[PDB]
Design a protein around this ligand. Structure first.
Ligand SMILES: CCCCCCCC/C=C\CCCCCCCC(=O)O[C@@H](COC(=O)CCCCCCCCCCCCCCC)COP(=O)([O-])OCC[N+](C)(C)C
Ligand SMILES: CCCCCCCC/C=C\CCCCCCCC(=O)O[C@@H](COC(=O)CCCCCCCCCCCCCCC)COP(=O)([O-])OCC[N+](C)(C)C
Ligand SMILES: CCCCCCCCCCCCCCCCCCCC(=O)O[C@H](COC(=O)CCCCCCCCCCCCCC)COP(=O)(O)OCCN
Ligand SMILES: CCCCCCCCCCCCCCCCCCCC(=O)O[C@H](COC(=O)CCCCCCCCCCCCCC)COP(=O)(O)OCCN
Ligand SMILES: CC(C)CCC[C@@H](C)[C@H]1CC[C@H]2[C@@H]3CC=C4C[C@@H](OC(=O)CCC(=O)O)CC[C@]4(C)[C@H]3CC[C@]12C
Ligand SMILES: CC(C)CCC[C@@H](C)[C@H]1CC[C@H]2[C@@H]3CC=C4C[C@@H](OC(=O)CCC(=O)O)CC[C@]4(C)[C@H]3CC[C@]12C
Ligand SMILES: CC(C)[C@@]12C[C@@H](OC(=O)CO)[C@@](C)(O1)[C@@H]1CC[C@@H](C)[C@H]1[C@@H]2OC(=O)/C=C/c1ccccc1
Ligand SMILES: CC(C)[C@@]12C[C@@H](OC(=O)CO)[C@@](C)(O1)[C@@H]1CC[C@@H](C)[C@H]1[C@@H]2OC(=O)/C=C/c1ccccc1
Ligand SMILES: [Zn+2]
Ligand SMILES: [Zn+2]
Lengths: 662, 662
C-alpha cells in the first residue's frame, strides 16, 4: 500500500502515532489544585494554600498554567475581586495583569490593579494604548486621570536616527508599534476625552492615516479602517448638534464656515455631506430664494432663465454701484452661479455662431481679419485667461493642479492663446488672397482654425462640471469620473496590445508601401475611398488598428498588389488576432471592470456627489470672482462658545455610544 | 526626529501628554456612595442616605452623575420599582425620567412615573412621541388612555408666520421636530390604536411622507423609511383578513372596490399586490371563466382567438340590446379586454395593408382620394380620438398627463389628424397627375405620407402596453420602462458630448463645404453612396456623429478635396476621440448603469408588475369605454361593518407583532 508518509513527522507504517511534540513542563498536583481553587472561587482554599506557601517553598506563588494564564489572570477572567485582592496582598506576580483586565473591560478589576513569560499582548502595548483599542470610555478615563502618555509618532517620511535604526534592526516590531500608536490615537473615546478640538483632531488624524495607508503599502487596510473610524467619529459628533446655533458655532470656528473649509481640505466627505451641514449650506446658497425648495419646477425654470437672460444687467449693476439694491444681487451665490452659467452659455452660443455663415469672410483670404463673432468671442477668452491666472495666484499651483477641470481650462486657454497668436501671425505675414487649395500644409490660418476647433470642443465639454449642481446629473458625473480611472488602466493595456500588433503588421507590410501617385485618386492611407497602405508605416498602422476597433478599416487593406497569398494570410491573421484580443477580450475587460467599479461607486455616490456639490457651492460664496467673463476684466469668546458646544456634543456622543453598546 | 505635532493639543516632545480636556465637576464621596447604593439595589442604604439628606444640606437629592444619569435614571435602568417609588416620594427631580422609562420599554416604571441639565433626548420629544417611536403597544396605550396630543404638522409647502419664523430662527430644530412628529404619526401601533381608519391613515401618511422625502432633499432616507413603514403596515393589516367577506368589506369601503382605487391613487403597490386582493381581483376579472386558471394553454388560446374573432359580433350585440344574454357578454372585463385587443390588432392589420398593393392608387396623382383601406382605417382613428377625449373629460388633464402611454396616444392621434388634414388639403388644392419626381419638397401628399408612417410606428408600438396583462411580458415591460429613465439621463450626457464634438468638427470642416453639383451623383451629405460633406454644416455634423455611433459613417468623410493633411488628421482625431468617448465610454456607462438599475428593478419587479396589471384590469371594470373602436362612436351599516372588520384585523395584527417581538 502506497501511504502518505511524513505528514506530521520527519521519520520515514499504516498509522500516524500522535504525541505531544512541543511538550511543556506541567505543574504539580498541588499547583493544579491551586489553579483549580482560583478558577472555582474557593476563597478559603486559595487563602490557605498561599498562606502555607508563604512558610515553605513547596508551592509556587507565580505558578503559570500551560495555557499561559497564572492564578491572577484566572481571577481576572472570572471577575473575582476578592481573590484578586488576596493574591495581590501576598505578592503575586502582577506582570501584564492590567492589560488582561483592560481587554476584559471590567472597571472594578482595572481599578483594583491600578491601586495594587508568555503574554497575549505584544511588548509595545501599554495600558492606555490597549484601553484606547477597546474604546471603553470608563477605562480610558480611569487611565487618563492617573496622568499617562502615548509616544508621539513620527512624520510619515522621517529619516532620523531612531527611525532608520528601529526599522533596520526590527521592522516588524516598528511597524506594529506605529500601527498600535495610531490605533490608540484614532480612538473616538480618547479623542473625545483628551483632545482640545475633537473635530479638528479627527480631521487631521483621518488625513494622516489615509496618507499612511498610501505609504504603508502593507497594512493598508488597517490604516484605512482607522481613517474611516476618525471620519465617522467627526461626522457622529456633528450628528449630535441639536440647534442651528450649535451647528453654526462648530462650522464657523477658526483656530464664514472655516471649519467646513478645513473639512473640505481634509476630504472629510461624510462630515460635509451630513444633512444639517448640507441644510445650512443650502440656506446660504439660496440666499435670495427662501422658498426655493417649495417651488414648482416651471417656476424655477422661469426664474433661472430670467436671471440668466439678465446676467449682463446684473454684472453692469454690480460694476456701476456694488452697494445697491441691484449691485449686490449678483453677490448671492445662486444668482452668481446662474449669471456665470449664462455667461458661459452665451460664449458657447457664439462659438457655435462662429462656424455658421451669418457673417463670414472669404475662405480664400490667407490671414483674414477677425469676424465680428470672433471679435465678440475675444472678451470671454481674455476673461477666462484672467480668471484662471487670478485663481492660480490666489491658490498656488499645488491647489491649481489638484483640480482636473482646472487642467482642462489650462488646455483650453493655451489653445485659445495659440489661436490668437496664429491669427496675428497669419494677418501680419500674409496679404494676398491665394486660393485655399493652394495653401501649404502648415499654413498658420489652417493651424489656427484647427486649434480653434479643438478649443471649441474643450469649451463645450467644460459644461459637464455644472452637472455637480444637479440632483440627477451630479451622481452621474461622479460615477463617470470615477470609472475614468479604470478606463485609463485599460487604456494602458490596450495601448500595449496596439503597439505589439502595430509592430507586427508594419514589419510585415512595410515592403509593399505603394507611392501615393500609384493609388486610384492620388490618395494614400485609410482615409480614402479605396483604403490602402494601412500597415505601410508605423503611424498609419497605429491609426488603422485604432479604426479597426470601430469597424472602419475594411478587410481588403490586408491584401498586397503583388498578391503574396501567404503574406496576405499572415497579415489577415494578425489583424484577426488583434480584433479578437481587443474587441472581444479587452473591451469586455472594460465592461466587467466598469460594472465592478460602478457597484463600488453606487455604494457611496450620494456622499461623493454632495461633497463635490459643496465644493462647487463654496466656490461661489467668496467675493473674489463675482463678475463672470467678460465683465471680470473691467476671538477668545469664540473659542469659549466652541468649547461649550464641543462639551455638549461629546457628552451626547459618549452617551449615545454607551447605549449603542447595550 | 520629525514628530507629528499638534495632534491632540494646540501647544507646540516625543510623547503625547494625555489629560482630561473637558473636565467636569465630579460628585462627592458621599454622593458617589449614594449613586453606588442606587445602582446596587440597597434599598435600606438609599432610604437612610436621603432620609438624613432631608435634615441637612450636605447631601444632594438631585445629584447628577458625570454620565448625566441621576439616581432616578439608574433606578429606571435597573427596573428598581421600589427605589424609584422611594425616590419619588422624597422629591427627586423627575425631569425627563418618563422618557428614559419609555425608551427602556418597561411598563411598570412608566405606570409608576405616570402616577408620580443633560438629556439623551432632544427637547421637542414628548412621552407620546417617544412611545410611538418605540412602537410599544402597551406604553402607547397607557399614554393615550391619559388623553394626550401630538402637534399637527403643517402642509409641506406652508408659508405661515410660524413656519417662516421657526425655519429662519432655528432650521435644524424645526426639521428635527417635523421628522419626530412624522415618526410618531407613522407608528403602526399608534395608527392601529388611535386612527379611525387605520388603512386610509396609512395610505395618506405614506403618500405625504413620500412627498416630504421628495421636498426635504436632506433627511430623504428617514422620510422614505417612514413611508415604507406606513405601506407595510397597511399591507400587513390586509394580511390579517381570514375570510373573503372581511376582504370585500375592506376593499369595497367608501368614506365596487373603492378602497382599492384609493390604494391605487396613493401608489400603495404592496397593498394592491397582496395575494388575497389579487385573488379577488382575478375572480372579478375572469367573470365569465370560473375555471380559467385550471385550463390548458391551448384551450385558452382557442377561447381567446374565438372571442377576438367575434369582437364585432359582441360589440353589435351590446349596441342592439345591451341587456341580453349576448349584449352584456362584452361587459365582462376579460371579454372586454379581448375585444379591445382584437379591435386594435385589426386596426394594425389594416395599417399593414395600407402599404401593400392589394388595392392601390397611382403614385403620380397629387392629392388622391382615400383608399378603401384608408376609408376603413378612418373609423378606428375617429374612435381613438373620441376615446381619448372622453378619457380626458372623465379624468382631468392632471390624471391624463400622469400616464406616459396616454401622451403617446396623444401624439398618435395628433399625427393622424394632421394626416387627415393634409390629405384633405392635397385633395382640394391639387387636381392634376404630376409625376412624383416633379413634386416639391413640401408637397402636402409627401408630408401626409410621412406623418402617416410615423403614426403607424406609434400605433404598432402601442401594443407594448398590453404586455402588462402577461405573467412573463409584464415584468419585462416594468424593467424596460424603469431603465428608460437612466437611458434618458445618459441621453443628456451623450447629447452634450455630441454637441461639443459637432461644434469642433463643424468649425474645422465648414470651409470645405462642396456644392451638391460638384459631387459624384449630384448627391450631398452622408446618405449618399459616396458620403461627403459630413461636417460641412452643424445639422449634418450632428447626423454624422449619430450615425458614426452605429458605424455607418465611413472614414473617408474626414478627408477634404484640398488634401490639407494637418486639417484632415485633426478632423480624423476629433472623430476618433468622439468614437472613443461615445462608443466605449458612454455606452459602457449605459451598460453598467442599466445592470445596476436592473438589479434594483428585479428586487421589486413582481410587486411593480402586479400593481400595473391591477391598474390595467381596473381600466376594464368600468362601464364607460365598453365598446372598442370603431364601435365607440356609434351607508352607516357599511361603516359599522368596516369598523368591526378593522377591529378584528387590528387585534390580529397587534397580537402578531407582539409575538414577532418575541
Ligand atoms: C494643449 C495645447 C498646448 C499648445 C498647443 C499649441 C501648439 C501650437 C504650436 C505652434 C504651431 C504653429 C507653428 C507655425 C509653424 O511654423 O508650423 C510648423 C509646424 O507646426 C506644427 O507642428 C503645428 C503643431 C500644432 C500642435 C497642436 C496641439 C494640439 C493639442 C490638442 C490637445 C511648420 O513646420 P514644418 O514646415 O512641418 O517643418
Ligand atoms: C407629435 C406630432 C405633432 C404634430 C405634428 C404635425 C405637423 C404638421 C405641421 C404642418 C405640416 C404641413 C404644412 C404645409 C406646408 O406649407 O409645409 C411647409 C413646411 O412644412 C413642414 O415644416 C412640415 C413639418 C412636419 C412636422 C412633422 C412632425 C413629426 C413629429 C414626430 C414625433 C412648407 O414651408 P417651406 O416651403 O419649407 O417654407
Ligand atoms: C489634436 C486633435 C484633436 C484632439 C481631439 C479632440 C479634442 C479633444 C476632445 C476632449 C478629449 C478629452 C475630454 C476630457 C473630458 C473631461 C472628463 C469629464 C468627466 C469627469 O467628470 O472628469 C472630471 C474632470 O476631469 C477633467 O476635466 C480632465 C481634463 C483633462 C483635459 C485634457 C485635454 C487635453 C473629474 O474631476 P474631479 O472633479 O474628480 O477633480
Ligand atoms: C420624425 C421622424 C420620425 C420619428 C422617429 C420614428 C417614429 C417614432 C418612433 C417611436 C419612438 C418613441 C417610442 C416610445 C416607446 C414608449 C416606451 C415603451 C416602454 C415603456 O414601458 O414605457 C411606458 C410608457 O411610456 C411611453 O409610452 C412614453 C411615450 C412617449 C411617446 C413620444 C412619441 C413622440 C412606461 O409607462 P408607465 O406605465 O410607467 O406610465
Ligand atoms: C445637452 C445638450 C442639449 C446641450 C445643452 C447645454 C445646456 C443647455 C445644458 C447642458 C447642461 C445643463 C446644466 C446642467 C446642470 C445644471 C443644474 C440646474 O439646476 C440645479 O440643480 C442647480 C441649482 C441648484 O443647485 O439648486 C441649473 C442649470 C444647469 C447648470 C444646467 C444648465 C443648462 C445646461 C448647461
Ligand atoms: C411580436 C410580433 C410577432 C407582433 C405580434 C403582435 C401581436 C400578435 C402580439 C404582440 C403582443 C401580444 C399581446 C401580449 C400580451 C397579451 C397577454 C395575453 O394573455 C394574458 O395573460 C392576458 C389574459 C389574462 O390577464 O389572464 C393576452 C393577449 C395579449 C394581449 C397578446 C396578444 C397578441 C399580441 C398583441
Ligand atoms: C482618441 C485619440 C487619443 C487617438 C485616436 C487616433 O486617431 C486616429 O487614429 C485618426 O488619426 C489617434 C491618432 O489618437 C491614435 C492612433 C493610435 C491610438 C493610440 C489612437 C488614439 O486612441 C486611443 O488612445 C484609445 C483608444 C480606445 C479606447 C477604448 C477602447 C478602444 C480603443
Ligand atoms: C433617434 C433620433 C431622436 C435622432 C436620430 C437622428 O437621425 C438622423 O441622424 C438621421 O437624420 C436625429 C435627427 O434624431 C438626431 C441627430 C443628432 C442626434 C440627437 C440624433 C437623434 O439621436 C438621439 O437622440 C440619441 C442617440 C443615442 C442613444 C443611445 C446611445 C447612442 C446614441
Ligand atoms: Zn492502498
Ligand atoms: Zn524619526
Amino acid at each position: 500500500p502506497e501511504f502518505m508518509a511524513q505528514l506530521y513527522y520527519k521519520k520515514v507504517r499504516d498509522r500516524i502515532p500522535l504525541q505531544i511534540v512541543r511538550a511543556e513542563t506541567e505543574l504539580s498536583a498541588e499547583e493544579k489544585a491551586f489553579l483549580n481553587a482560583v478558577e472555582k472561587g474557593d476563597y478559603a482554599t486559595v487563602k490557605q494554600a498561599l498562606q502555607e506557601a508563604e512558610i515553605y517553598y513547596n508551592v509556587n506563588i507565580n505558578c503559570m498554567d500551560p495555557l499561559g494564564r497564572s492564578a491572577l489572570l484566572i481571577a481576572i477572567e472570572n471577575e473575582n475581586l476578592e481573590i484578586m485582592e488576596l493574591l495581590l496582598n501576598h505578592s503575586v506576580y502582577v506582570g501584564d495583569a492590567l492589560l488582561y483586565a483592560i481587554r476584559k473591560e471590567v472597571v472594578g478589576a482595572v481599578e483594583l490593579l491600578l491601586s495594587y513569560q508568555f503574554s497575549e499582548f505584544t511588548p509595545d502595548i501599554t495600558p492606555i494604548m490597549l484601553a484606547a483599542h477597546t474604546n471603553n470610555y470608563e477605562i480610558i478615563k480611569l487611565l487618563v486621570q492617573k496622568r499617562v502618555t502615548i509616544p508621539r509618532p513620527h512624520q510619515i517620511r522621517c529619516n532620523c536616527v531612531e527611525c532608520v535604526s528601529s526599522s533596520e534592526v526590527d521592522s516588524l516590531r516598528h511597524s506594529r508599534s506605529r500601527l498600535n500608536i495610531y490605533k490608540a490615537l484614532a480612538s473616538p473615546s480618547l479623542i473625545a476625552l483628551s483632545s482640545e478640538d475633537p473635530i479638528l483632531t479627527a480631521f487631521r488624524l483621518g488625513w494622516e492615516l489615509k496618507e499612511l495607508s498610501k505609504v504603508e503599502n502593507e497594512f493598508k487596510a488597517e490604516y484605512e479602517e482607522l481613517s474611516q473610524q476618525c471620519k465617522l467619529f467627526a461626522k457622529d459628533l456633528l450628528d449630535q448638534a441639536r440647534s442651528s446655533r450649535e451647528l453654526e458655532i462648530i462650522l464657523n470656528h477658526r483656530d464664514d464656515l472655516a471649519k467646513l473649509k478645513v473639512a473640505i481640505k481634509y476630504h472629510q466627505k461624510e462630515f460635509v455631506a451630513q444633512p444639517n451641514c448640507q441644510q445650512l449650506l443650502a440656506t446660504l446658497w439660496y440666499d435670495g430664494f427662501p422658498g426655493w425648495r417649495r417651488k414648482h419646477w416651471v417656476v424655477k425654470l422661469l426664474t433661472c432663465m430670467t436671471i440668466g437672460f439678465l446676467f449682463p444687467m446684473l454684472s453692469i449693476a454690480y460694476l456701476i454701484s456694488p452697494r445697491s439694491n441691484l449691485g449686490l444681487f449678483i453677490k448671492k451665490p445662486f444668482i452668481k452661479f446662474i449669471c456665470h452659467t449664462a455667461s458661459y452659455l452665451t460664449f458657447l452660443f457664439m462659438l457655435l455662431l462662429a462656424s455658421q455663415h451669418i457673417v463670414r469672410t472669404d475662405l480664400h483670404v490667407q490671414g483674414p481679419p477677425p469676424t465680428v463673432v470672433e471679435w465678440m468671442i475675444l472678451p470671454w477668452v481674455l476673461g477666462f485667461i484672467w480668471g484662471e491666472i487670478k485663481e492660480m495666484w490666489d491658490g498656488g499651483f499645488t491647489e491649481y493642479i489638484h483640480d482636473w477641470w482646472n487642467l482642462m481650462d489650462f488646455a483650453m486657454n493655451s489653445l485659445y492663446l495659440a489661436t490668437i497668436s496664429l491669427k496675428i501671425v497669419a494677418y501680419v505675414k500674409y496679404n494676398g488672397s491665394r486660393p485655399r487649395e493652394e495653401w501649404e500644409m502648415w499654413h498658420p490660418t489652417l493651424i489656427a482654425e484647427a486649434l480653434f476647433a479643438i478649443s471649441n470642443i474643450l469649451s463645450s465639454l467644460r459644461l459637464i462640471s455644472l452637472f455637480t449642481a444637479n440632483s440627477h446629473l451630479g451622481p452621474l458625473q461622479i460615477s463617470l469620473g470615477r470609472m475614468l480611472l479604470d478606463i485609463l488602466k485599460f487604456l494602458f493595456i490596450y495601448c500595449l496590445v496596439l503597439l505589439a500588433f502595430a509592430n507586427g503588421l508594419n514589419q510585415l507590410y512595410f515592403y509593399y508601401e505603394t507611392r501615393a501617385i500609384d493609388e486610384p485618386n492620388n490618395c494614400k492611407g485609410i482615409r480614402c475611398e479605396k483604403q490602402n497602405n494601412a500597415f505601410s508605416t508605423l503611424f498609419e498602422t497605429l491609426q488603422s488598428l485604432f479604426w479597426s476597433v470601430f469597424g472602419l478599416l475594411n478587410l481588403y487593406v490586408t491584401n498586397v498588389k503583388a498578391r503574396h497569398e501567404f503574406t496576405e494570410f499572415v497579415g489577415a491573421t494578425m489583424f484577426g488576432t488583434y480584433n479578437v484580443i481587443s474587441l472581444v477580450v479587452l473591451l469586455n475587460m472594460l465592461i466587467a471592470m466598469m460594472n465592478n467599479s460602478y457597484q463600488l461607486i453606487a455604494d457611496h455616490a450620494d456622499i461623493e456627489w454632495k461633497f463635490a456639490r459643496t465644493k462647487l457651492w463654496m466656490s461661489y460664496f467668496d467675493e473674489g470672482g463675482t463678475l463672470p467673463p467678460p465683465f471680470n476684466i473691467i476671538s477668545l469668546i469664540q473659542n469659549q462658545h466652541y468649547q461649550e458646544v464641543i462639551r455638549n456634543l461629546v457628552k451626547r456622543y459618549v452617551a449615545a455610544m454607551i447605549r449603542n453598546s447595550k
